[PDB]
Design a protein around this motif. Structure first.
Motif, PDB file in Angstrom:
ATOM      1  N   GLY A  45       0.857  -1.165   0.000  1.00 16.07           N
ATOM      2  CA  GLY A  45       0.000   0.000   0.000  1.00 16.07           C
ATOM      3  C   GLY A  45       0.898   1.221   0.000  1.00 16.07           C
ATOM      4  O   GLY A  45       2.106   1.105  -0.218  1.00 16.07           O
ATOM      5  N   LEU A  46       0.312   2.390   0.233  1.00 16.23           N
ATOM      6  CA  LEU A  46       1.090   3.574   0.549  1.00 16.23           C
ATOM      7  C   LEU A  46       0.615   4.084   1.888  1.00 16.23           C
ATOM      8  O   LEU A  46      -0.549   3.902   2.236  1.00 16.23           O
ATOM      9  N   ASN A  47       1.520   4.686   2.651  1.00 19.28           N
ATOM     10  CA  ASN A  47       1.125   5.519   3.765  1.00 19.28           C
ATOM     11  C   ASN A  47       0.961   6.929   3.260  1.00 19.28           C
ATOM     12  O   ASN A  47       1.698   7.356   2.381  1.00 19.28           O
ATOM     13  N   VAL A  48      -0.020   7.639   3.804  1.00 21.12           N
ATOM     14  CA  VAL A  48      -0.349   8.992   3.369  1.00 21.12           C
ATOM     15  C   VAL A  48      -0.363   9.885   4.597  1.00 21.12           C
ATOM     16  O   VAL A  48      -1.002   9.557   5.595  1.00 21.12           O
ATOM     17  N   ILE A  49       0.358  11.002   4.533  1.00 20.16           N
ATOM     18  CA  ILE A  49       0.298  11.992   5.600  1.00 20.16           C
ATOM     19  C   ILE A  49      -0.135  13.339   5.034  1.00 20.16           C
ATOM     20  O   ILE A  49       0.675  14.065   4.456  1.00 20.16           O
ATOM     21  N   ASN A  50      -1.414  13.666   5.211  1.00 21.79           N
ATOM     22  CA  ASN A  50      -1.955  14.963   4.788  1.00 21.79           C
ATOM     23  C   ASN A  50      -1.774  16.016   5.862  1.00 21.79           C
ATOM     24  O   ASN A  50      -2.203  15.832   7.000  1.00 21.79           O
ATOM     25  N   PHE A  69      -3.811  -0.106  -4.345  1.00 21.33           N
ATOM     26  CA  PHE A  69      -4.307  -0.299  -5.690  1.00 21.33           C
ATOM     27  C   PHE A  69      -5.478  -1.239  -5.578  1.00 21.33           C
ATOM     28  O   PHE A  69      -5.439  -2.215  -4.811  1.00 21.33           O
ATOM     29  N   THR A  70      -6.545  -0.898  -6.290  1.00 19.09           N
ATOM     30  CA  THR A  70      -7.739  -1.721  -6.324  1.00 19.09           C
ATOM     31  C   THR A  70      -7.633  -2.686  -7.494  1.00 19.09           C
ATOM     32  O   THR A  70      -8.445  -3.598  -7.623  1.00 19.09           O
ATOM     33  N   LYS A  79      -7.716   3.040  -3.652  1.00 17.55           N
ATOM     34  CA  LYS A  79      -8.643   3.477  -2.616  1.00 17.55           C
ATOM     35  C   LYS A  79      -7.844   4.036  -1.457  1.00 17.55           C
ATOM     36  O   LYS A  79      -6.841   3.443  -1.044  1.00 17.55           O
ATOM     37  N   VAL A  80      -8.283   5.174  -0.938  1.00 16.72           N
ATOM     38  CA  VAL A  80      -7.566   5.863   0.124  1.00 16.72           C
ATOM     39  C   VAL A  80      -8.461   6.025   1.344  1.00 16.72           C
ATOM     40  O   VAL A  80      -9.679   6.162   1.217  1.00 16.72           O
ATOM     41  N   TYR A  90      -9.518   6.909  -5.134  1.00 21.14           N
ATOM     42  CA  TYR A  90      -8.471   7.887  -5.324  1.00 21.14           C
ATOM     43  C   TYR A  90      -7.872   7.530  -6.680  1.00 21.14           C
ATOM     44  O   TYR A  90      -7.157   6.535  -6.800  1.00 21.14           O
ATOM     45  N   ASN A  91      -8.198   8.318  -7.707  1.00 21.83           N
ATOM     46  CA  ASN A  91      -7.767   8.010  -9.072  1.00 21.83           C
ATOM     47  C   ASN A  91      -6.865   9.107  -9.646  1.00 21.83           C
ATOM     48  O   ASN A  91      -7.248  10.276  -9.665  1.00 21.83           O
ATOM     49  N   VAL A  92      -5.669   8.744 -10.114  1.00 24.64           N
ATOM     50  CA  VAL A  92      -4.789   9.739 -10.758  1.00 24.64           C
ATOM     51  C   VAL A  92      -5.207   9.878 -12.211  1.00 24.64           C
ATOM     52  O   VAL A  92      -4.996   8.968 -13.006  1.00 24.64           O
TER      53      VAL A  92
END
Length: 149
Positions: A45-50, A69-70, A79-80, A90-92
């Motif tokens: 996955g990714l870790n996210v820090i907003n 990634f789905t 998905k986030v 969450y789509n780029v």
């Protein structure tokens, strides 16, 4: 649906990004100076820090989430989470060849971000990020242009 970036390198997406703009996401209603930061996880996955300055509350607020990634990892469909194990799309949907700028849509068309490695961008990029947003059926007039020094 929305077209998504279909030749993605995740390790090239890591590091800091600036919230150049968003829609009025009412989980960030009234945060300035915003950044998202991605790091790879042992699970893939990714870790996210907003992170966002509260310009009015003289404060910094920040949450952590993860993203997965789905589907195929070379396709920028994910998905986030943002507050707990509660996930949304969450789509780029626009990404330059070198990972300076991104347009990212959320779970539906109320959710849209412009992101950049640099705290500001030109218009040849800012208006070009809108041409795609307009093409994907978003209302670019919804954009709050988040402030960066």
């Amino acid at each position: 649906g929305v077209t998504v970036v279909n030749n993605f390198d995740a390790k090239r997406y890591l590091g800091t990004w600036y919230e150049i703009a968003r829609f009025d996401h009412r989980f960030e209603r009234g945060l300035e100076k915003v950044t998202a930061t991605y790091s790879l996880r042992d699970d893939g996955g990714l870790n996210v820090i907003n992170k966002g300055y509260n310009p009015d509350r003289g404060m910094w607020q920040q949450s952590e989430g993860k993203a997965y990634f789905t589907g195929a990892p070379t396709r920028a469909a994910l998905k986030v989470s943002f507050f707990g194990p509660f996930y949304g799309g969450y789509n780029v949907i626009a990404l330059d060849r070198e990972y300076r700028h991104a347009l990212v849509s959320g779970p539906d068309r109320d959710y849209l971000w412009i992101l950049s490695r640099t705290p500001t961008i030109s218009d040849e990029v800012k208006q070009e990020m809108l041409a795609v947003a307009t093409r994907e059926g978003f209302d670019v007039s919804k954009f709050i242009w988040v402030q960066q020094p």
